[PDB]
Design a protein around this ligand. Structure first.
Ligand SMILES: N=C(N)Nc1ccc(C(=O)O)cc1
Ligand SMILES: [Ca+2]
Length: 223
């Protein structure tokens, strides 16, 4: 997260870190056994880390649970990033509490102008490279479909939306991948892609979660 703020320990209780020896992506806890992330975060050997603030220090609220299976969306295209969504099942159910909690799925899509919270452990620099240890947060509005398409000609599908600031300065960045965009207590987005970070007229692009609620629910119901 570039141009954000320190969230505060365990203030984003649905935020997870995906770890394969090191943090490599974010994710969102949607029930005791399931995490939603980006398809471009897919790899084998994933451990889900819940209750994290400082990802380099055991602070006492963590739960470390290995993934039993990952399900990348059937229509994910890694070239265009269309359908950039994946589900991860935990080997055992997380113990839910005030600091480790699921986030609600949307019942309808959020509109341009809706204010949201984007969070992650990604790069905090738009030019250089600096990775934070503690979770970073950014309050950002959803942008109109037209402004999103104008920012990225030929690249915005019906399964994507832009959020952030056309002036730049405040954005998601590498390492925030797969993490949450939450608006009015609902998971509306997944950190998906962009051109650099916090650059003028290049806001973050997010997977449009409301399009996938049926797939998420039916997948969970049979797996
Ligand atoms: N938000 C931006 N303009 N850049 C950007 C966004 C997401 C990712 C990701 O890897 O998920 C990387 C870079
Ligand atoms: Ca920790």
């Amino acid at each position: 997260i570039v141009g954000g703020y320190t969230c505060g320990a365990n203030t984003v209780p649905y935020q997870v870190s995906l770890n394969s020896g090191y943090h490599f992506c974010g994710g969102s806890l949607i029930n005791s056994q399931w995490v939603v992330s980006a398809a471009h975060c897919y790899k084998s050997g994933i451990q889900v880390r819940l209750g994290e603030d400082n990802i380099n220090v055991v602070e006492g609220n963590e739960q470390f649970i290995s993934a039993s299976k990952s399900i990348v969306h059937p229509s994910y295209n890694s070239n265009t990033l269309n359908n950039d969504i994946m589900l991860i099942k935990l080997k055992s159910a997380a113990s839910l509490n005030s600091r480790v909690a699921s986030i609600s799925l949307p019942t309808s899509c959020a509109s341009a102008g809706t204010q949201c919270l984007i969070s992650g452990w990604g790069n905090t620099k738009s030019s250089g490279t600096s990775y934070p240890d503690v979770l970073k947060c950014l309050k950002a509005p959803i942008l109109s479909d037209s402004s999103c398409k104008s920012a990225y000609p030929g690249q915005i599908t019906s399964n994507m939306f832009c959020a952030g600031y056309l002036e730049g300065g405040k954005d998601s960045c590498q390492g925030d991948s797969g993490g949450p965009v939450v608006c009015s207590g609902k998971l509306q987005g997944i950190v998906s892609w962009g051109s650099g970070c916090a650059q003028k007229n290049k806001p973050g692009v997010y997977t449009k979660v409301c399009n996938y609620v049926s797939w998420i629910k039916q997948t969970i119901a049979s797996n």
